[PDB]
Structures are given as structure tokens and as C-alpha cells.
DNA sequence: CCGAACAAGCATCAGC
DNA sequence: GCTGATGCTT
DNA sequence: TTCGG
């Protein structure tokens, strides 16, 4: 982390614009600048040097000059003193509380963890589970625990139907030594873009992971996307493990490669890659890559038989997952 | 200067 | 009930 | 907030 102080500042600015100002484009600009700087392999010595990188403009360059001179940013230090800003920023750390709900809660004088706990009745289901596991959800998962969880998920899925294929994506698939949560891509040959030949494909997997007490709570759940909570089992008399966020995405079997590209990320990598696709005349979602016609209307899905096929279409060199951690 | 900035599933709510 | 917008999330 | 045209 050559430039950890700079990228921390930019990330804190990003979070302020998202949570407090509700300025999504400023938030993306700071995150993008933080991303391009994190992979820059020199210790930055001036805002001018940083402004040579794409995504760092005049305003971020000036902030880097102030940071490098003083070790601080006056704008952030004032933001940190403001009670409303600090409280809104804090409340958004609860899963299910966003900028709108956080500002609504602070308006009614709900502005601390203890305030949240005594007003459970004012939370929706998702928010209540995010409050319940607030402490756990801020801990990272050592890859060794990710490996144990993987083994549980893949084996339980196989007991439901040997034709399911579960793939752990996210930062885990990118080779990270720790992960924020577990991301599972799921396919079944009964579910393709051409037909759904079995109902309850995702449900059966969820209920089986619940029966073996791996899934403990549900944040949201539909036919193709599950967002919930899981926990490794612990040995006799040992401390329990923290509860962990788990996301499961059922994707049409024939669209696996677009799906695993999507779910491997990173999120910024996906944004960069989809934006480049547009510049090249394609649009990419988790299902397909399609060309844009004369009027910018999406055309027919193109054939895809690997992740690299997608990179080829937009004329990017193939990047292994471990090189997508933007 | 100015328009564009990735794409979408689930929960919730207003309106009919 | 449905449609469509918005919030929040991946 | 940044960038391309
Ligand atoms: N097009 C897009 N795609 C996205 C987006 N947000 C998330 N994703 C995709 C890519 C993520 O890796 C994947 C998982 O989402 P997750 O939050 O778990 O990201 P990890 O890479 O695993 C970091 P960790 O803290 O969990 O370790 O979902 C998005 O806005 N736009
Ligand atoms: Mg993840
Ligand atoms: Na630049
Ligand atoms: Na939140
Ligand atoms: Na996730």
C-alpha cells in the first residue's frame, strides 16, 4: 500500500458524497480515483503527478497536495466534526440502511447504535438483521474460513441435486486472502435462457442450507437472488464463529460465463469493463453481451463460450480474476 | 461548454 | 391485485 | 468529479 493515506482520504470523501450529499457521481469519481491510485506502483509525490492518472482531475489533485503537505484534509476534519454528517455516515453502516433512511432516522433523533436497538420496531426486516449482526458484518473472513464455507456449500448443493454447480465468486475467486462475505453463483441445467423446467431451484438450495443450520437468516430472497446470513459450525466448547453475509445468484446455465464475469468483479472492474464495452459498441450485463445498433438499441446476444470471449469482443487482453481487484 | 457516467434483483410504497 | 418508481443492494 | 468530443 504505497499510497494508503491518499486512497483512505478519497474513500472517506466518496462515502461522504454517497451517504450525506447523495451525490452518486461524486461518489463514483472519488472511488475511481482511489482505485486508479491504489494500483499506481510509485509513492505519489504531488497532485500534479497524480493528475496524470485517468480519473484524477483538478479538484482531487488539489486535495492530494493538501494531504501530502499536512497529512490531513481540512474538508474531512470539518465533516468529522459535524454531528448530522457523522450520524448519517454511521447509520449507513447498517445493512439495509441507506442514505435516505439514515437521514430519515437522524431527523427523528435516531442517531446511535443504542438508538437503533431501542427502535427495532421502526426497522424493516433487512435493517433489523443488519442491526442484529452489525458487529459481525464488519469483520472480514480469512480465506481459510472461506474454504470451509465453500466446502459446506458445494457439498450441500450436491446433496440436493448432483447437477447443480455452485461456484464461489467475488473477492474469493480473485484470490483474496480475506473476503467481506461469500458470493455463490449457482447453475442447474433445468434453468436456461430458453426455459425454466423446474420451480423452486434456488429455494431448494436455500432450505437445505437452512436445514443444516448454515444459513441462519434471510435479508431478501426471490427466484434468482438470495441475500442472507450464514455461520460456520464450531467445535465443542470453542467460541462460535461470527455470522457472515452470503449472496447466492442463480443464473441461466447457458449464460454462466457472463454470470461468473459479473459475480467475480470487482464492482469497479465491472463498471470500467462495461463502460469500455459501450465505447466499443456493446453492452454487457450478467446474462449477455450484445451489440449496440445505430440508435444505441441493444441487439441479439452474441455467442460466448468463455470469459475470454467477452474480453475479445471489446478488444481487451484477458485478465485473470486475480488481476480484476480494482 | 455539456452530456454521460454499468446494469439489475428484491423490498417497499404510491396510485389505480 | 398490478404497474412503476424509488431505495438499497450485488 | 472527471472526461471526451
Ligand atoms: N456490475 C456491477 N457489479 C457489481 C456491483 N457490485 C457488486 N458487483 C458484483 C462484483 C462483485 O465482485 C460481486 C460481489 O459483490 P460484493 O459486494 O460481495 O464484492 P466483492 O468483490 O466480493 C468484495 P468483498 O468485501 O465481498 O470481499 O458482485 C456493481 O455496483 N455493479
Ligand atoms: Mg463479496
Ligand atoms: Na487525470
Ligand atoms: Na447500509
Ligand atoms: Na456479496
PDB file of C-alpha atoms (C1' of nucleotides) and ligand atoms in Angstrom, chain A residues 27-28 31 140-141 146 169-174 176 178-184 245 247 249 259-272 274 284-286 324-325, chain B residues 6-8, chain C residues 9-10, ligand 1:
ATOM      1  CA  UNK A  27     -19.002   9.181  -5.100  1.00  0.00           C
ATOM      2  CA  UNK A  28     -18.035   7.288  -8.270  1.00  0.00           C
ATOM      3  CA  UNK A  31     -13.877   5.708  -5.776  1.00  0.00           C
ATOM      4  CA  UNK A 140     -13.519  -9.862   7.339  1.00  0.00           C
ATOM      5  CA  UNK A 141     -13.397 -13.578   6.565  1.00  0.00           C
ATOM      6  CA  UNK A 146     -13.915 -19.144   3.105  1.00  0.00           C
ATOM      7  CA  UNK A 169     -17.070 -15.802  -6.848  1.00  0.00           C
ATOM      8  CA  UNK A 170     -16.369 -12.303  -5.519  1.00  0.00           C
ATOM      9  CA  UNK A 171     -13.029 -11.488  -3.921  1.00  0.00           C
ATOM     10  CA  UNK A 172     -12.593 -15.188  -3.100  1.00  0.00           C
ATOM     11  CA  UNK A 173     -12.368 -16.106  -6.770  1.00  0.00           C
ATOM     12  CA  UNK A 174      -9.937 -13.191  -7.225  1.00  0.00           C
ATOM     13  CA  UNK A 176      -8.085 -12.553  -1.848  1.00  0.00           C
ATOM     14  CA  UNK A 178      -9.739 -12.252   3.194  1.00  0.00           C
ATOM     15  CA  UNK A 179     -13.268 -11.528   1.973  1.00  0.00           C
ATOM     16  CA  UNK A 180     -16.097  -9.279   3.118  1.00  0.00           C
ATOM     17  CA  UNK A 181     -18.703 -12.006   2.503  1.00  0.00           C
ATOM     18  CA  UNK A 182     -19.321 -15.150   0.458  1.00  0.00           C
ATOM     19  CA  UNK A 183     -20.661 -14.889  -3.108  1.00  0.00           C
ATOM     20  CA  UNK A 184     -22.067 -18.092  -4.648  1.00  0.00           C
ATOM     21  CA  UNK A 245     -23.170 -12.303   4.801  1.00  0.00           C
ATOM     22  CA  UNK A 247     -25.212 -13.884  -1.511  1.00  0.00           C
ATOM     23  CA  UNK A 249     -27.257 -15.847  -7.542  1.00  0.00           C
ATOM     24  CA  UNK A 259     -22.608 -14.510 -14.860  1.00  0.00           C
ATOM     25  CA  UNK A 260     -19.227 -15.527 -13.460  1.00  0.00           C
ATOM     26  CA  UNK A 261     -17.637 -12.434 -15.004  1.00  0.00           C
ATOM     27  CA  UNK A 262     -20.278 -10.317 -13.264  1.00  0.00           C
ATOM     28  CA  UNK A 263     -20.079 -12.067  -9.886  1.00  0.00           C
ATOM     29  CA  UNK A 264     -16.258 -12.181  -9.798  1.00  0.00           C
ATOM     30  CA  UNK A 265     -15.974  -8.403 -10.122  1.00  0.00           C
ATOM     31  CA  UNK A 266     -14.645  -6.273  -8.644  1.00  0.00           C
ATOM     32  CA  UNK A 267     -17.537  -3.811  -8.767  1.00  0.00           C
ATOM     33  CA  UNK A 268     -15.230  -1.083 -10.089  1.00  0.00           C
ATOM     34  CA  UNK A 269     -13.714  -3.565 -12.537  1.00  0.00           C
ATOM     35  CA  UNK A 270     -17.240  -4.287 -13.812  1.00  0.00           C
ATOM     36  CA  UNK A 271     -18.016  -0.581 -14.158  1.00  0.00           C
ATOM     37  CA  UNK A 272     -14.792   0.020 -16.091  1.00  0.00           C
ATOM     38  CA  UNK A 274     -18.997  -2.236 -19.064  1.00  0.00           C
ATOM     39  CA  UNK A 284     -22.647  -6.269 -21.005  1.00  0.00           C
ATOM     40  CA  UNK A 285     -24.873  -7.413 -18.175  1.00  0.00           C
ATOM     41  CA  UNK A 286     -24.682 -10.609 -16.091  1.00  0.00           C
ATOM     42  CA  UNK A 324      -9.555  -7.687 -11.547  1.00  0.00           C
ATOM     43  CA  UNK A 325      -9.247  -6.329  -7.979  1.00  0.00           C
TER      44      UNK A 325
ATOM     45  C1'  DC B   6     -22.946  -0.266 -15.642  1.00  0.00           C
ATOM     46  C1'  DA B   7     -26.653  -2.948 -15.015  1.00  0.00           C
ATOM     47  C1'  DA B   8     -30.127  -5.172 -12.465  1.00  0.00           C
TER      48       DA B   8
ATOM     49  C1'  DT C   9     -28.133  -3.860  -2.582  1.00  0.00           C
ATOM     50  C1'  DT C  10     -24.967  -7.334  -5.611  1.00  0.00           C
TER      51       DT C  10
HETATM   52  N1  LIG E   1     -21.831  -4.516 -12.475  1.00  0.00           N
HETATM   53  C1  LIG E   1     -21.751  -4.386 -11.056  1.00  0.00           C
HETATM   54  N2  LIG E   1     -21.381  -5.429 -10.376  1.00  0.00           N
HETATM   55  C2  LIG E   1     -21.296  -5.417  -9.028  1.00  0.00           C
HETATM   56  C3  LIG E   1     -21.581  -4.268  -8.368  1.00  0.00           C
HETATM   57  N3  LIG E   1     -21.415  -4.527  -7.057  1.00  0.00           N
HETATM   58  C4  LIG E   1     -21.017  -5.782  -6.930  1.00  0.00           C
HETATM   59  N4  LIG E   1     -20.946  -6.346  -8.116  1.00  0.00           N
HETATM   60  C5  LIG E   1     -20.540  -7.619  -8.433  1.00  0.00           C
HETATM   61  C6  LIG E   1     -18.997  -7.708  -8.470  1.00  0.00           C
HETATM   62  C7  LIG E   1     -18.675  -8.036  -7.240  1.00  0.00           C
HETATM   63  O1  LIG E   1     -17.336  -8.604  -7.071  1.00  0.00           O
HETATM   64  C8  LIG E   1     -19.840  -9.131  -6.878  1.00  0.00           C
HETATM   65  C9  LIG E   1     -19.933  -9.414  -5.384  1.00  0.00           C
HETATM   66  O2  LIG E   1     -20.311  -8.238  -4.717  1.00  0.00           O
HETATM   67  P1  LIG E   1     -19.500  -7.878  -3.334  1.00  0.00           P
HETATM   68  O3  LIG E   1     -20.018  -6.655  -2.688  1.00  0.00           O
HETATM   69  O4  LIG E   1     -19.534  -9.040  -2.408  1.00  0.00           O
HETATM   70  O5  LIG E   1     -17.989  -7.558  -3.921  1.00  0.00           O
HETATM   71  P2  LIG E   1     -16.592  -8.420  -3.589  1.00  0.00           P
HETATM   72  O6  LIG E   1     -15.767  -8.293  -4.870  1.00  0.00           O
HETATM   73  O7  LIG E   1     -16.832  -9.856  -3.243  1.00  0.00           O
HETATM   74  C10 LIG E   1     -15.700  -7.516  -2.224  1.00  0.00           C
HETATM   75  P3  LIG E   1     -15.960  -8.342  -0.605  1.00  0.00           P
HETATM   76  O8  LIG E   1     -15.930  -7.310   0.514  1.00  0.00           O
HETATM   77  O9  LIG E   1     -17.295  -9.008  -0.631  1.00  0.00           O
HETATM   78  O10 LIG E   1     -14.884  -9.327  -0.371  1.00  0.00           O
HETATM   79  O11 LIG E   1     -20.924  -8.617  -7.319  1.00  0.00           O
HETATM   80  C11 LIG E   1     -21.991  -3.151  -9.117  1.00  0.00           C
HETATM   81  O12 LIG E   1     -22.303  -1.950  -8.456  1.00  0.00           O
HETATM   82  N5  LIG E   1     -22.051  -3.239 -10.447  1.00  0.00           N
END
